[PDB]
Amino acid sequence: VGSLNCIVAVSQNMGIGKNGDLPWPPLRNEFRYFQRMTTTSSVEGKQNLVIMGKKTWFSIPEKNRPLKGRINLVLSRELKEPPQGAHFLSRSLDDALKLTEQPELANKVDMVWIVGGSSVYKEAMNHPGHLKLFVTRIMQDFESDTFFPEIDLEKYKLLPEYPGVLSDVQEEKGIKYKFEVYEKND
Ligand SMILES: NC(=O)C1=CN([C@@H]2O[C@H](COP(=O)(O)OP(=O)(O)OC[C@H]3O[C@@H](n4cnc5c(N)ncnc54)[C@H](OP(=O)(O)O)[C@@H]3O)[C@@H](O)[C@H]2O)C=CC1
Ligand SMILES: [C]C1=NC([N])=NC([N])=C1[C][C+]123[B@]45[B@@]67[B@@]89[C@@]1%10B81%11B698B746B814B562B%10%1143
């Protein structure tokens, strides 16, 4: 795999989770952005792959698992098969990336999206080569118990804009946020 993508929504105090859910009330269009970015592939015959940790999998409501229109892969060091409804299980990110090149997934996977949580992001962000980080900055503090790893600015550059990503401050349910895209190359 020549490139990876991470996608996250983070509060101003770097929070991503609280009590097995998001720290902030649900933001419908922010969720639709996540859906659009992770689902969309114009390569006929392929789908995108989402990679997530075990707690993130179980944080998705049952009726919405697996995430529709995407191949769902869960990371765990302890499970011996995928959680019910998930398509694949790997012991690490590198194992997961190697899996996509074996006969079953060889001709089936377009983009790879890392969707959290903290340890999944941390590993992905140090993976060699080209990686983009799609980061929604929720412009408020929220009490959180799970946090997004620091963005190494020696490695990552904030892109001034990105095709298909809105540049202006957004607002839903009185909460302001903005969409950012970062990239590293080495
Ligand atoms: N705001 C946002 O964009 C997002 C928020 N969330 C929130 O974050 C919380 C869940 O995330 P978090 O608590 O960090 O937990 P994770 O989803 O990262 O799950 C942790 C478990 O996943 C497995 N795991 C995680 N990383 C790896 C790794 N790199 N290699 C192998 N296995 C791995 C382990 O399972 P095992 O113990 O079985 O080995 C580990 O105990 C929830 O509150 C959720 O709502 C989650 C994603 C994004
Ligand atoms: C809200 C949001 N927004 C975003 N820009 N990236 C993300 N990774 C998430 C977190 C998610 B996405 B959608 B819902 C919550 B559950 B499911 B999937 B799971 B992961 B977790």
Beta bridge partners of 177: 138, 170
For 186, the token pair is 């080495």
Amino acid type, 8: V
Beta bridge partners of 158: 182
Q: What number of CA atoms fall less than 13 Å from residue 30's CA on the CB side?
A: 25
Atom of ligand 1 nearest to the CA of 79: 38
- 115 within ligand 2 shell (Cβ under 6 A): yes
For 42, the token pair is 């114009």
Residue ranges of alpha helices (H) inside the chain are 28-39, 54-59, 93-99, 118-125
User: Could you give the CA distance from residue 33 to residue 104 in angstroms, rounded to a whole number?
Assistant: 29
- Which domains, ranges and CATH numbers included, belong to the chain? 1-186 (3.40.430.10)
Q: What are the angstrom distances between the C-alpha of 109 and each of 22, 48, 120?
A: 28, 6, 19
Q: Which residues contact 174 (CB under 8 A, 6 or more apart)?
A: none
Q: Using the mean position of ligand 2's atoms as its centre, give its distance from the Cα of residue 20 in Å.
A: 12
b/e map 164-179, b = 16+ CB within 10 Å: eeeeeebeeeebebbb
Q: Which residues contact 24 (CB under 8 A, 6 or more apart)?
A: 11, 138, 140, 142, 175
- 177 within ligand 2 shell (Cβ under 6 A): no
User: Could you give the CA distance from residue 134 to residue 159 in angstroms, rounded to a whole number?
Assistant: 10
**Number of DSSP helices (H) and strands (E) in the chain, helices first:** 4, 11
Atom of ligand 1 nearest to the CA of 90: 31
Q: What are the angstrom distances between the C-alpha of 184 and each of 5, 105, 130, 153?
A: 11, 26, 6, 9
User: Could you give the CA distance from residue 146 to residue 118 in angstroms, rounded to a whole number?
Assistant: 7
User: Could you give the CA distance from residue 36 to residue 48 in angstroms, rounded to a whole number?
Assistant: 11
**CB under 6 Å to ligand 1: residues?**
8-9, 16-17, 20-22, 52-56, 59, 75-79, 91-93, 115-120, 123, 146
Q: What angle do CA 123, 126, 132 make, to 5 degrees?
A: 100
**C-beta atoms surrounding 42 within 10 Å:** 6
Task: State yes or no: 43 annotated in a binding site.
Answer: no
Q: Which residues contact 102 (CB under 8 A, 6 or more apart)?
A: none
For 140, the token pair is 């408020």
Kindly report the three-state secondary structure assignment for every residue of 49-89.
EEEEEHHHHHHCCHHHCCCCCCEEEEECCCCCCCCCCCCEE
**Considering only CA atoms, which of 70, 35, 50, 55 is closest in space to residue 4?**
50
Report the Cα 65 to chain-centroid distance in Å.
15
User: Could you give the CA distance from residue 177 to residue 24 in angstroms, rounded to a whole number?
Assistant: 12
Residue at token pair 């895209």: 181
For 10, the token pair is 């983070």
**Considering only CA atoms, which of 131, 126, 120 is closest in space to residue 52?**
120
φ, ψ for residue 152 (rounded to 5)?
A: -70, 100
Report the Cα 2 to chain-centroid distance in Å.
17
- To the query of whether residue 105 is one of the catalytic residues in this protein, the response is no
Q: Using the mean position of ligand 2's atoms as its centre, give its distance from the Cα of residue 106 in Å.
A: 26
User: What was the structure determination method?
Assistant: X-ray
